[PDB]
Amino acid sequence: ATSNVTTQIGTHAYLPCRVKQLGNKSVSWIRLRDGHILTVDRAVFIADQRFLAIKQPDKYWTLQIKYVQARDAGSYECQVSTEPKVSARVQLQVV
Amino acid sequence: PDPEFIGFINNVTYPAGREAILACSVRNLGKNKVGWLRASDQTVLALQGRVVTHNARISVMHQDMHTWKLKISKLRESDRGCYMCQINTSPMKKQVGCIDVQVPPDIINEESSADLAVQEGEDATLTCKATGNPQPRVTWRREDGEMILIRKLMKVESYNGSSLRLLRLERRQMGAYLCIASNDVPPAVSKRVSLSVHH
Ligand SMILES: *[C@@H]1O[C@H](CO[C@@H]2O[C@@H](C)[C@@H](O)[C@@H](O)[C@@H]2O)[C@@H](O[C@@H]2O[C@H](CO)[C@@H](O[C@@H]3O[C@H](CO)[C@@H](O)[C@H](O)[C@@H]3O)[C@H](O)[C@H]2NC(C)=O)[C@H](O)[C@H]1NC(C)=O
Numbered sequence: 001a002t003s004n005v006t007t008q009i010g011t012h013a014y015l016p017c018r019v020k021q022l023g024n025k026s027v028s029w030i031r032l033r034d035g036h037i038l039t040v041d042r043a044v045f046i047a048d049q050r051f052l053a054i055k056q057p058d059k060y061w062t063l064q065i066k067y068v069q070a071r072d073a074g075s076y077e078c079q080v081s082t083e084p085k086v087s088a089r090v091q092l093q094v095v
Numbered sequence: 096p097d098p099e100f101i102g103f104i105n106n107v108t109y110p111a112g113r114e115a116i117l118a119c120s121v122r123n124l125g126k127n128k129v130g131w132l133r134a135s136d137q138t139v140l141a142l143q144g145r146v147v148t149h150n151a152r153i154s155v156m157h158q159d160m161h162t163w164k165l166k167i168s169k170l171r172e173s174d175r176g177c178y179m180c181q182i183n184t185s186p187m188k189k190q191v192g193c194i195d196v197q198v199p200p201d202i203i204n205e206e207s208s209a210d211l212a213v214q215e216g217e218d219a220t221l222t223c224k225a226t227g228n229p230q231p232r233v234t235w236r237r238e239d240g241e242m243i244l245i246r247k248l249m250k251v252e253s254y255n256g257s258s259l260r261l262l263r264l265e266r267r268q269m270g271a272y273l274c275i276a277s278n279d280v281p282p283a284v285s286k287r288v289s290l291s292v293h294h
Contacts, residue, residue: 026139030132035134035137035189037130037139037183045181047185
């Protein structure tokens with residue numbers, strides 16, 4: 001899908017995981033600027049509860065960030081837990 | 096209260112094939128959680144006591160409530176690098192443990208000189224490409240012990256470099272040359288390349 005998501009400050013952003021989940025492997029989101037682990041499958045690691053991982057039936061996941069602020073802008077990476085990983089980035093732009 | 100680290104993660108150096116263990120110790124973890132991230136390729140490895148990567152050589156262990164262990168069996172050279180232990184405090188807390196995977200030297204015959212012949216007075220370059228971690232030094236010497244002749248030409252009994260460049264060859268220089276590859280990880284290896292010089 002798209003690697004550029006634009007979101008008005010205060011509205012929910014939906015970041016597409018542009019990589020397909022394979023078999024029983026996990027889908028995880030990380031923040032690229034600091035390496036902060038965000039979500040592993042539906043478990044949310046980061047304390048910020050605006051972050052939510054949505055599992056779709058067709059194996060394509062989404063990272064929701066509620067009430068986006070300027071500080072949320074930056075690159076996010078979706079990764080499937082094969083070894084080596086299958087991953088795809090998304091630039092979140094805040095306006 | 097706020098979880099914190101007990102000491103720093105100890106960093107490890109092993110030959111390939113050994114097992115590496117990185118211990119991340121935390122006091123008062125409370126309701127927080129510990130995740131592992133391989134820093135070289137920003138790969139999520141584990142979350143709490145569950146392994147995320149399907150890499151079957153990697154696992155996590157937790158006995159003492161304070162110590163969170165990452166175990167990498169049968170270390171491969173691509174496992175080399177640093178490993179981030181993340182605590183989901185706000186802001187995040189992290190420590191990093193690093194693995195140096197040593198690999199003993201190996202000379203690649205495809206990319207290295209075979210026995211070769213040169214006409215007298217022509218040029219001839221012998222070359223041994225070597226792999227290993229640390230990157231192996233390459234030393235050229237003559238099996239019979241005579242000094243090699245290279246530009247000051249001058250007589251050295253050893254040359255350090257992958258490519259031994261010989262030019263304006265005379266008949267005395269025929270015979271067997273050794274390239275030795277070493278990186279202080281045993282064993283060093285050598286290739287025997289024979290140079291014939293026609294009239
Ligand atoms: C294992 O190695 C890590 C990382 O070491 C560093 O990074 C590697 C990539 C290599 O280039 C190493 O050569 C390089 O030194 C060690 O971590 C570092 O430890 C020091 C402690 O001496 C940390 O400094 C402090 O940070 C604390 C808070 O964490 C402050 O309170 C101190 O005032 C001081 O500033 C440093 O941040 C840390 N670096 C990283 C990236 O984590 C680690 O100590 C080492 N393990 C052991 C047992 O020595």
